[PDB]
């Protein structure tokens, strides 16, 4: 599993692979690991599928629950803190093998500078969190390959399209070196999922766009 998130001028992008495994066996090819949890936040989770999906679903319900109760959404700091509390709550089960870590990407409408309002927050199994000011972050079994790829490719990120391509290429490198991360399946037409978030909100990237970028990367690696 690999989830990547990176900041671009005016927004944030998050993408995740589609592979579900049990040991060495591939048990899913079209799986969704990045969820729009808020008008302005997406969450991608790595680890035990059941725990990950329960995290995303419960989290979205919690955010919208506060928003309807109090008439205003949580501050981004509040969102961070609630996700952290949720992870720490799962710590014991994580020690028993039901481990899931989230990666949070959001757009802070209350930020001073609308171009650096993108936010990327990573978490550990104890709920400790870090807001990444270096622009990118990844989580999952291929996260270090993806992060190191983005270290070299991040200088090319100037808008949503360049950041989306860098994200998809980092997922490509991740799948290239980690068998638990699935690469682009051109036979079945299955490609990573991506969410982009700017001032106008969080939208799902159509799969055909991700496909176009994937073919660009592939031919770039062939000749």
């Amino acid at each position: 599993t690999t989830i990547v998130a990176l900041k671009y001028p005016g927004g944030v992008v998050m993408a995740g692979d589609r592979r579900s495994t049990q040991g060495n066996m591939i048990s899913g090819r079209d799986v969704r690991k990045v969820y729009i949890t808020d008008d302005y936040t997406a969450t991608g989770i790595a680890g035990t599928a059941a725990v990950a999906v329960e995290f995303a679903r419960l989290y979205a319900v919690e955010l919208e629950h506060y928003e309807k109760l109090e008439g205003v959404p949580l501050t981004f700091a509040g969102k961070i803190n609630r996700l952290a509390i949720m992870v720490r709550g799962n710590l014991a089960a994580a020690m028993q093998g039901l481990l899931a870590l989230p990666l949070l990407a959001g757009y802070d409408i209350h930020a001073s500078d609308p171009q650096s309002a993108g936010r990327i927050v990573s978490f550990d199994a104890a709920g400790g969190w870090n807001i990444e000011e270096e622009g990118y972050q990844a989580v999952g079994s291929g996260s270090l390959f993806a992060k190191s790829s983005m270290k070299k490719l991040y200088s090319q990120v100037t808008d949503g399209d360049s950041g989306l391509r860098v994200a998809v290429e980092a997922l490509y490198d991740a799948a290239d070196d980690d068998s638990a991360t699935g690469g682009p399946d051109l036979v079945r037409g299955i490609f990573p999922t991506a969410v982009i978030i700017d001032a106008d909100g969080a939208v799902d990237v159509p799969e055909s766009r991700i496909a176009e970028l994937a073919r660009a990367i592939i031919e770039s690696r062939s000749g």
Binding site: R57, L58, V61, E64, H65, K68, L69
Partner: peptide, 13 residues
């Protein structure tokens, strides 16, 4: 109103 929101959110979950 809050009780209704709890009911709706809980059942939807």
């Amino acid at each position: 109103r809050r009780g209704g929101i709890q009911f709706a959110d809980t059942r939807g979950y």
